[PDB]
Amino acid sequence: KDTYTDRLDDWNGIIAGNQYYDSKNDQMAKLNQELEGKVADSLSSISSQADRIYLWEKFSNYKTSANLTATYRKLEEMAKQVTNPSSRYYQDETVVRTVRDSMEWMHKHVYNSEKSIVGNWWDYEIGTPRAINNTLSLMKEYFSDEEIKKYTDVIEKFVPDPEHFRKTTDNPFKALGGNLVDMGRVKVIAGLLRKDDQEISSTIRSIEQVFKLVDQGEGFYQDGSYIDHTNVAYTGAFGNVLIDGLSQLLPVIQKTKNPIDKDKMQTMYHWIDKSFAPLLVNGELMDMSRGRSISRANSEGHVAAVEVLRGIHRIADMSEGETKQRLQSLVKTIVQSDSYYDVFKNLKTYKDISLMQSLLSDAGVASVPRTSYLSAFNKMDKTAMYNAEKGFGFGLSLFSSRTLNYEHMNKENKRGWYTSDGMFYLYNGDLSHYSDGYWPTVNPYKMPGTTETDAKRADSDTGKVLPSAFVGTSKLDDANATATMDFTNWNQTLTAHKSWFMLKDKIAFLGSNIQNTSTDTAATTIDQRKLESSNPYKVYVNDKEASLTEQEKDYPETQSVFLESSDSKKNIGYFFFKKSSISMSKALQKGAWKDINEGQSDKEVENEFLTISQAHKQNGDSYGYMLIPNVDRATFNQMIKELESSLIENNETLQSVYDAKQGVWGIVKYDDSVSTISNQFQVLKRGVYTIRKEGDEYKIAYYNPETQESAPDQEVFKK
Ligand SMILES: CC(=O)N[C@@H]1[C@@H](O[C@@H]2O[C@H](C(=O)O)[C@@H](O[C@@H]3O[C@H](CO)[C@@H](O)[C@H](O[C@@H]4O[C@H](C(=O)O)[C@@H](O)[C@H](O)[C@H]4O)[C@H]3NC(C)=O)[C@H](O)[C@H]2O)[C@H](O)[C@@H](CO)O[C@H]1O
Numbered sequence: 130k131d132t133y134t135d136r137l138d139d140w141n142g143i144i145a146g147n148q149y150y151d152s153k154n155d156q157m158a159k160l161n162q163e164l165e166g167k168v169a170d171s172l173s174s175i176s177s178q179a180d181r182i183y184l185w186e187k188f189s190n191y192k193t194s195a196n197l198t199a200t201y202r203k204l205e206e207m208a209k210q211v212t213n214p215s216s217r218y219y220q221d222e223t224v225v226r227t228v229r230d231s232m233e234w235m236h237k238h239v240y241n242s243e244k245s246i247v248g249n250w251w252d253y254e255i256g257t258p259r260a261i262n263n264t265l266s267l268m269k270e271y272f273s274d275e276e277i278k279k280y281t282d283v284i285e286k287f288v289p290d291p292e293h294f295r296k297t298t299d300n301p302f303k304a305l306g307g308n309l310v311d312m313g314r315v316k317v318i319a320g321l322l323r324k325d326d327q328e329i330s331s332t333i334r335s336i337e338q339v340f341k342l343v344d345q346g347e348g349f350y351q352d353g354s355y356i357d358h359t360n361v362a363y364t365g366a367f368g369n370v371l372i373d374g375l376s377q378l379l380p381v382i383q384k385t386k387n388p389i390d391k392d393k394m395q396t397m398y399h400w401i402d403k404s405f406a407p408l409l410v411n412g413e414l415m416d417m418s419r420g421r422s423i424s425r426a427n428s429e430g431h432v433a434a435v436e437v438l439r440g441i442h443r444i445a446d447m448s449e450g451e452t453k454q455r456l457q458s459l460v461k462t463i464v465q466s467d468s469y470y471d472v473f474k475n476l477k478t479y480k481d482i483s484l485m486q487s488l489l490s491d492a493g494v495a496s497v498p499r500t501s502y503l504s505a506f507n508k509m510d511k512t513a514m515y516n517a518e519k520g521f522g523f524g525l526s527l528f529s530s531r532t533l534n535y536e537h538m539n540k541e542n543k544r545g546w547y548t549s550d551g552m553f554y555l556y557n558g559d560l561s562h563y564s565d566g567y568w569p570t571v572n573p574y575k576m577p578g579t580t581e582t583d584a585k586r587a588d589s590d591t592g593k594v595l596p597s598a599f600v601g602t603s604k605l606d607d608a609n610a611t612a613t614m615d616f617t618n619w620n621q622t623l624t625a626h627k628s629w630f631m632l633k634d635k636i637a638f639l640g641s642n643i644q645n646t647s648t649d650t651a652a653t654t655i656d657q658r659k660l661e662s663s664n665p666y667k668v669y670v671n672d673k674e675a676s677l678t679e680q681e682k683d684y685p686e687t688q689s690v691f692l693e694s695s696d697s698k699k700n701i702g703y704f705f706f707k708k709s710s711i712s713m714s715k716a717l718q719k720g721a722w723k724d725i726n727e728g729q730s731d732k733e734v735e736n737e738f739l740t741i742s743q744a745h746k747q748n749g750d751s752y753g754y755m756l757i758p759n760v761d762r763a764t765f766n767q768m769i770k771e772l773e774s775s776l777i778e779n780n781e782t783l784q785s786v787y788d789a790k791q792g793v794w795g796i797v798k799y800d801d802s803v804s805t806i807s808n809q810f811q812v813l814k815r816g817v818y819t820i821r822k823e824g825d826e827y828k829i830a831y832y833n834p835e836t837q838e839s840a841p842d843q844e845v846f847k848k
Pocket of ligand 1: 249250251256302307308358359366367369370422436539
């Protein structure tokens with residue numbers, strides 16, 4: 130037809146990619162097989178009675194917005210197969226008619242301009258409109274330009290403003306980040322379908338705002354943080370949608386009369402390198418950045434990671450030169466480092482499958498293991514650490530007066546209460562740790578690293594910001610950093626000065642000033658590790674094999690605990706600076722995804738967990754231990770002997786551990802008193818420090834969590 134159909138043709142190549150299909154292509158044929166079965170199920174179950182209440186019974190309750198999107202997504206699947214020469218439904222008269230028909234019926238009795246949002250606005254302005262655009266785009270050769278307009282009319286009624294969503298409501302909000310991108314997949318495509326030029330130009334102009342880094346509110350920050358939903362760390366869910374959708378759109382947008390300036394898009398590489406890259410470990414997308422998505426059974430870390438990777442790859446393909454090359458190497462090495470998840474299980478279009486296949490087999494693209502790195506995402510209170518030498522990742526999940534602890538929205542993530550209360554993540558040889566039903570089987574009252582009372586929590590509860598702004602990380606280099614959280618629990622009955630000292634190949638956990646004014650007992654979960662029936666651990670307490678049971682066994686006078694696997698890369702050792710009183714247990718924990726997410730399956734799931742905790746029976750209590758992963762038993766025993774004097778201090782005003790091997794100090798000062806460290810120097814300001822002694826010199830890394838600022842050396846360091 131015209132230039133719009135041209136772009137609409139490019140879109141089809143991106144969202145389905147029938148033109149690249151190849152039956153002799155294993156991965157492609159697998160996805161085709163999947164779509165064939167989908168429309169087969171849809172067709173064999175659609176209602177074909179004279180006068181019907183619903184198109185599909187499973188999605189009849191049209192009061193539930195979700196049923197509109199699910200119903201239309203089914204027609205998009207039919208539209209994909211009907212235009213695929215290799216599909217059994219290719220140009221099928223029945224399939225063509227049911228799509229056209231279904232569009233009309235849905236339009237007649239369910240979704241039209243004369244209707245109003247009922248349920249989630251999201252489906253009315255994003256979910257459904259996208260499915261409609263895609264369906265009309267794929268089958269434009271079967272619809273009249275007039276019918277197309279007719280069917281996208283309702284989209285214009287609900288989403289008239291490319292800059293605001295929920296415009297038909299009493300409180301529309303400005304589209305930013307992920308939402309802004311979907312606004313493009315809604316109005317740019319719909320604009321294309323309607324041959325509406327003003328719509329295209331204004332939506333693109335509106336989309337261009339996503340390329341702006343922010344220093345407040347929602348968006349990407351200079352330090353790599355990405356905030357969404359007012360104050361929630363969301364690089365891993367909304368960031369996904371952002372990069373995923375934008376990467377699909379850009380190729381199309383760029384071929385219009387309103388291409389986005391190159392210098393304007395250059396910021397995308399900032400997101401990739403500073404925001405996304407650090408959150409990817411062995412093909413897994415750190416859960417601490419995925420908000421409520423963690424409660425979705427079909428979006429575990431490795432799966433969520435491919436959403437980002439496919440977006441990054443599309444961007445690399447859109448680039449050229451070293452940029453294309455480096456991005457390709459980035460995607461290639463990450464995917465190849467994933468021995469647990471098959472990346473193709475989440476490449477849902479032929480072009481995406483194709484791109485990935487050529488990348489993996491192109492010998493010209495280097496795939497070299499990622500180097501060590503430490504990202505201090507202070508603008509979202511998270512820290513990601515990775516050691517390339519020992520091969521383990523570490524995630525520190527916190528929150529402050531600037532951020533919400535956990536998101537429970539739309540009945541999702543009902544029990545994430547403590548996932549940001551100083552929760553830590555360890556990524557080692559067991560790539561499936563946080564997968565295979567970890568979230569619905571993990572005991573939510575004992576999130577690893579967290580200090581909490583055992584009071585009962587309500588599923589109906591929702592997030593809160595922390596009273597204190599004294600939460601933050603001061604990074605010295607790629608292997609060393611220190612963090613602290615002026616912790617107070619959800620009902621202000623317990624406090625604790627929790628601090629972490631990341632020192633290259635280990636992390637020390639220090640807690641002091643632990644107080645409890647309530648009646649419930651207080652304890653810190655040193656860990657709750659999910660086990661693999663295939664790789665059993667040999668537990669040692671004080672280097673003596675211990676036999677754990679579902680019943681908590683107490684181990685007083687503990688100097689160390691060691692979990693031994695046949696794979697050094699799965700070993701976890703804990704050295705207690707001062708002999709401590711801990712309790713351990715290994716028990717089968719059962720649950721269902723529905724428990725933490727109403728819309729998930731109620732199917733029972735179960736996993737075996739090893740729980741280690743330390744009770745706090747008095748005020749002024751404390752804890753102190755070093756987490757040492759990926760070393761064998763003899764090396765762990767020898768190391769804890771060397772660290773016998775690493776703890777420099779752990780009280781209510783000062784906390785610090787020292788790495789003699791590196792000549793690095795980790796320090797946290799809660800007050801402005803003069804602290805003399807190791808009889809060598811003085812730290813003078815309240816805040817977080819990471820210092821390295823280089824012979825006669827001292828490299829200083831100071832951070833003031835409250836003002837979110839560093840400071841001149843002479844202000845905080847002396848001698
Ligand atoms: C209660 C209310 O209306 N609160 C508003 C808040 O509304 C919420 O906005 C979200 C949003 O996207 O901004 C909505 O989140 C999305 O809901 C979808 C339907 O349940 C769900 O499918 C989305 O999940 C993603 O879907 C993608 C897709 O289907 O294409 C997937 O490709 C993607 O992998 C998957 O994660 C879900 N989005 C995310 C990122 O999880 C939420 O339902 C809706 O209630 C407004 O946004 C804010 C404005 O800042 O104000 C509140 O008051």
